[PDB]
Amino acid sequence: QNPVPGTMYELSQMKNGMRNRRISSNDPAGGVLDHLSDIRPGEKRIIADIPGSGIINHIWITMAPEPHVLNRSDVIIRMYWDGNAYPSVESPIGPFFGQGWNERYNYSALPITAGPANGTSMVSYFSMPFAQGARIEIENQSDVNLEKFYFYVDYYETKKLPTDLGRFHAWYNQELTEAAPEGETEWAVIGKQDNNTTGDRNYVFADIKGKGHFVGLNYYVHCPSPIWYGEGDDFWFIDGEEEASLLGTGTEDLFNTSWCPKEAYSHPYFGYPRVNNDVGWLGRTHIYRFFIEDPVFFQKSLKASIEHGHANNLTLDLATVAYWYQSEACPLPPAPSKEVRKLKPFINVPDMHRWRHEWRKNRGEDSKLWGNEMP
Amino acid sequence: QNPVPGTMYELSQMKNGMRNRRISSNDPAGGVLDHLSDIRPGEKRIIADIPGSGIINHIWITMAPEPHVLNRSDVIIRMYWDGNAYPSVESPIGPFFGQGWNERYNYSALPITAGPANGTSMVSYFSMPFAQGARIEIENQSDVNLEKFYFYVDYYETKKLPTDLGRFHAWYNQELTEAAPEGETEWAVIGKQDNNTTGDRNYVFADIKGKGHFVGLNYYVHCPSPIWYGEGDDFWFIDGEEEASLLGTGTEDLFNTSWCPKEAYSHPYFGYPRVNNDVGWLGRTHIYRFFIEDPVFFQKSLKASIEHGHANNLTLDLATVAYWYQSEACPLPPAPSKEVRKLKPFINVPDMHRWRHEWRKNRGEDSKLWGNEMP
């Protein structure tokens, strides 16, 4: 046991057994073509195919053209461990690296981040062990050529993988959520709110069978109302228990924040790298939390979900990437279709004036209705 | 005729006939009570009662308590010329000095402005001639004591008023405007737009009988929709003509601006000292234009109006102060009641979510309605 607790002490210890390697897009002829080229629409490219045992320790990727031209929500990254035919990592590449939608922004989370120039640099420091090979694949599901693909995949080669190491998994999910039958009753603004004791209509962000521990969540909400999107509670069902053993209080609360915030904020383990910047909470918000000091263990299964509004009353376009380890390389739930991933239009001024018009009709159309009158 | 055209040349000319005087709140005992005190709710106070002939050349006023406590839209200033029983100036004092609602903000218009600290200083450089007396009265129509009232009324005394001088007038008007029977059809967003060839349902900001010329407009809109409030055209009917001889194209256009602006901006003769700072054009905007180089003359009458939205389709809380001169001191149209002047609540997040709810009902309540769908 170390006599001093931190990483800096550990970094001064001599180590054995690991040899650095790097798969990169370096031009082998010595020239300027230090990128892969022309991953056309509909095409897949294996960017790294590593035999044997090792541990990925760092990934850096960037792409051309820019995010406003090539939608990073339509370029997919997949990773396959141990010669499995199924991926244990499957996500749109932007969302995997904490870049929502087709947008770009710098931030500074510890294990995964996007950096300069203005969010085009995609960086991961998650450790990704493998015993019998690793393959990383990129698929262009956009309608634009992926002109240039630059990358480093840094890894340690070893003769024998330490026997206690697991396998990295990540899964993108997305749903346009269903409003409650009585309507969007958030904050009791339109009427009485229901209870939700079961979690049955929650939005699911992980559904895992096996042994492991949960380490991260990137949450992307596109809210089509000005109302606060985040009253919904997190539910974690560990090991098939009937009642969730971890129950939360709200969505900002899960992300270590409070009172319906909409301010950009950075901590190594949690933050808001993109906030809506409009009336109320209308538009897009990205929130992250990494569970590095505080991973969620499970021995047999984990199903983790969150209400979409209090008792699932709201329509939200919700997407998530969940990150976790398992004792072996396991398959994932189904991927959302390209259709589910289609970007939604921002609710705009003509749209809201149309709301106002239907509201005036239903309030009886007095020619001096202000906009706040109750029935 | 002067050989050089500007004011600076004129300022170097020796003048005769005018003696400076000042009515002020200076403490005659020499002390610190350099203000009037305790103009209680419901009370009137004559602050200046000047006999004979003169010309007001400068007014400065400030009040305690601050604008968030004492509503400057409920403290009224009136001015009476030539011993008339009727006022030729009647307005809430904030709006007269280009401070809308109960708000405060510095700006820099040439003839009338509000200045530091943060809009509490109220300044006028309009020249206000009178032959047989001047009286300035303040009335507290608020529910708060007017604790301190500081002022300078600077004027020139003369033995005989120059015979070509007119008389300053100003009038506050306000209306919560009526939406069109087919609804608020602005931008053709909800349906087809009507024509308005008559101007009959326009918002009126001046209705003057006599000879004179129009010199200013302060325009205060509280828009309860996100839609652009300003498509409405100005109409000026001079001298009883059946068809308006001056017709405009839009409200920003009248104020020397273009394309639905919502940015703070200052020119000596026109500007936006308070902009809505919210989604679309929802909330409050103050616009001014002074007609100093370009006054609007009339010999018999002027009726000046503006559409409230294209063809008067919108509900807006509109208030205006109009400024003008006439050949003699004339009465004004009726004052809006204290009830018409009541501040309207800002349209808020619960309000708009209630709009959305009525819209969902009328679009058929599919549980995944986004918010943009058409019938």
Next chain:
Amino acid sequence: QNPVPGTMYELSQMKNGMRNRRISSNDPAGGVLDHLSDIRPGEKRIIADIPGSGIINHIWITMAPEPHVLNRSDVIIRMYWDGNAYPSVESPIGPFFGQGWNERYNYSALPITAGPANGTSMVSYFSMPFAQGARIEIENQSDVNLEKFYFYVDYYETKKLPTDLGRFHAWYNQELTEAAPEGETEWAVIGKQDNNTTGDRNYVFADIKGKGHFVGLNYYVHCPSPIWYGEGDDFWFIDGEEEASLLGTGTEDLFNTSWCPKEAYSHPYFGYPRVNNDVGWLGRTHIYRFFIEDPVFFQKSLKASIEHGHANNLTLDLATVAYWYQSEACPLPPAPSKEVRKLKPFINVPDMHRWRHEWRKNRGEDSKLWGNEMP
């Protein structure tokens, strides 16, 4: 021993023995009451009472009403381990989470932080082991109802606590410090400065008996002079030694800064989240340092103190929270009274003009004294 030094490698290792649990304010009926309610003035509430062995891994708390209404320096958090009657954690809750006084501000320290909305979210990632129970109690020592109390207490349950784990302690102290008898001689501005070879009149921020290691300090100074508050040296007496084995050079210096800074600054392990923003160093400053890579070990005792100005010459309102581990759960020194914790008024303009007046008297009252003259 791990072949790779950091946390990311460790996070990819499979673990056994720990089961996640969470005590939270989730509404068990399924509804919106996801908070405790109405902890009235003078009342105590047990928010978590955990039997047996475990490790707290994460705490999140927020409260209503807001910090300008409910003083977070008057709501106390206490933690009791191993069925002890005495607390091993005792502090006002704001200061515990790095929110001084009755103020609010976001910051980003690694182990403890306050986050959005504007400092209302209170977060701890300190690990807090216990073998025979844990109890967390909140006491409302304010004059305002604690209306809503939201929380997550995330912990690992275990059948048997690892035998090398200690116990988390934290202690709030506060003192209005005594100026030196010859006056506040800082910087030799008023006269000669004394020596301090003993540390006897220092401000004490830890006084611990037992085995353990020191891990953090939150320092809150309210300085009633414009002079620099921070010339005072830190003294650490380990294991009853007569002469302190760790001696510092200044207060900014202890906090890894230099030359009397007053700029907001964030590093994971040290920073200034609230700076005085006034003339010189007048007003309030919050500084933190966490000793994560560099804990201060002790086997028998630690007494740690800092001069309040060079050789304890200054009157300062100083408050601190100290954080540490011990080999077992131990009691704390006495808590400051509610009276010691009373907020001090900011030194204001009338106050300083009164200083100037006494200065003029003592310099002989020449009618043109500028303010810099020496005797």
Next chain:
Amino acid sequence: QNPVPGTMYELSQMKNGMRNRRISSNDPAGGVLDHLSDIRPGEKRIIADIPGSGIINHIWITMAPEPHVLNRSDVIIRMYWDGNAYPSVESPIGPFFGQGWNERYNYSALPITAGPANGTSMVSYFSMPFAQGARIEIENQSDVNLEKFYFYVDYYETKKLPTDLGRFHAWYNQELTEAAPEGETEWAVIGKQDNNTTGDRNYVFADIKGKGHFVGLNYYVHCPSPIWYGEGDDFWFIDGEEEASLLGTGTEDLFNTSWCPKEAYSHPYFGYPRVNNDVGWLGRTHIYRFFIEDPVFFQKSLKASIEHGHANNLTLDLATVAYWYQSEACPLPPAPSKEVRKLKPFINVPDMHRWRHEWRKNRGEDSKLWGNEMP
């Protein structure tokens, strides 16, 4: 009489009788030496010597080295009209152009301003008629060489001066004012305040014998207290009257502002181009007002003064430039000495801590005096 009231109409009128001329520092050899050179310490230079009748219509000046090297409060400008031996304009050149002390800042007053780069451009649009010559002289009373002096003096030549034109005057005054014998009783902070019914101890900014009208004031205060400097009332004695016919209420009030402002602000006729930017009102403030629409006429004399604090209780370093016209070219009051114009040091942190020390002594030196305690 013109049928349209403004300058723009007048500018479209053809004029006769005036021929443009310009005295400038243009290099007559065609080269780059488009400046005067080397006006050494103690030296005077005539920059313009114009025979006969004309009207100065525009002056632009700039100097090297920069204001932090060559003190523009120690370079004097003088103007002599009609072959008089005495100047009718006498001021330090910075203060004349609205640049206080040895500082530099852009602003935008209408008749006189300082402009880019950062206040080095000095501009006047005052009209300055003369019948029998004009001479403009610069004197370097600084200890630094005036290396380069660039200028345009634009004027109209005429065969016969219009007989109604006056003559431009300006006078710099400065005083370190005397505190009241009972001390600086401003705001009644230290004790009871006196009355001032006479104006006898006021600071005088104009003392004029003759016929004319007053057109401007630049006011420069260096306040050595944090207290508000500006409670003092303006007094104007016209034509030898025993009681001042124009009495004000406060200093900000005279400058068309209210409630002790300290924010930068620009209107054509009044403003704050330099504010103190420190605790309370400690340090330097520059305020201006031009009386262009509202000149103060006098037939025989004008003496204009302002209290230095309420009833002249404060010590302030006050300096002013007053601007006016008279019917003929007249001499000025005495100039302040170079000694009176010496820059005062800013009151600093050691100074105020010394105040605090004398205050502690007089309050009895309890070791926990906070700083607000009363006797």
Next chain:
Amino acid sequence: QNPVPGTMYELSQMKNGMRNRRISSNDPAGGVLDHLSDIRPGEKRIIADIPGSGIINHIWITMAPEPHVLNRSDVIIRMYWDGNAYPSVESPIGPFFGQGWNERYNYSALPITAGPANGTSMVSYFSMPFAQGARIEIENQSDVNLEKFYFYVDYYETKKLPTDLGRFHAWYNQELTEAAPEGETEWAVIGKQDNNTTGDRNYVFADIKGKGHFVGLNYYVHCPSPIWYGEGDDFWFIDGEEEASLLGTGTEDLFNTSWCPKEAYSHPYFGYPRVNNDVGWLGRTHIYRFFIEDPVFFQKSLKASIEHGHANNLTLDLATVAYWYQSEACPLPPAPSKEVRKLKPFINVPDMHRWRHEWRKNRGEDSKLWGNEMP
């Protein structure tokens, strides 16, 4: 093995074997002289001489006078372990602590940083083990007295060093790089670009013989062209291999960024604390990356280099500090001379206009050459 992966769990573990010690500049007489004094030009001072076995866990240093007076690139820090005559750490002190050139700026890297006031505080959290002594020496190679030197060197004393600990090394290198013989062909702007398959003309930032691992790089570029400086690839030759096993794609790419960024950015492990802030990439840039989770291991040797522009085509003033551990204390490569470390002048406006002039000559000197014309 720990059941929970992070540092926070480890921090709650009781430890044995380590006793805190601190060498500091504390005044032993009790007074204000809490600094070393007067390290004159050409002088060396041992600031810490520790016998026996221990581990440095934290260093804080600050110096007077300020960085614009005393060039921190000319004050050298050296560290000697285990009684060796050669240093294993040798660098200019500013660059060692991530302060380039003679500049100052706050930043927030995890293991080494510069903090308030504005970059004067120099902080290291690298662990530095030693078995048979440690000596830290400062040498003043500047032409200015080092007036005050404040420091803490915090370390753990131990009876026996853990046998797996290595030794900290760091080395400053600098080169004014050679342009390619065909000219600076970056981006193919002036002509065809060459290949570089060997790395022979690369800029070398580490050249190490022994066993260990690489942990950091501070990179300082002064680019005398507006062109992007950073197309050059990193090459790492491990254990004497003929072909580099780690090959990169670009300089921003190595630093976890993309697309020629020039924006200030902070992540714990990489960032841009000083960017050029001028046309293109002209001037100075500082970039850092720490390899904490992802150290580069080597058993026999490491030579690490980077192209200076694509295929070493550019002239750059490049300086680096490299940080690493070895199994024992080893000597370093030669230090750059004081002459190599001389600050280069910023390319300025006269310089670039001279470029333009030579360009006009070579393009044939048409009098209307714009500046973009090709031959």
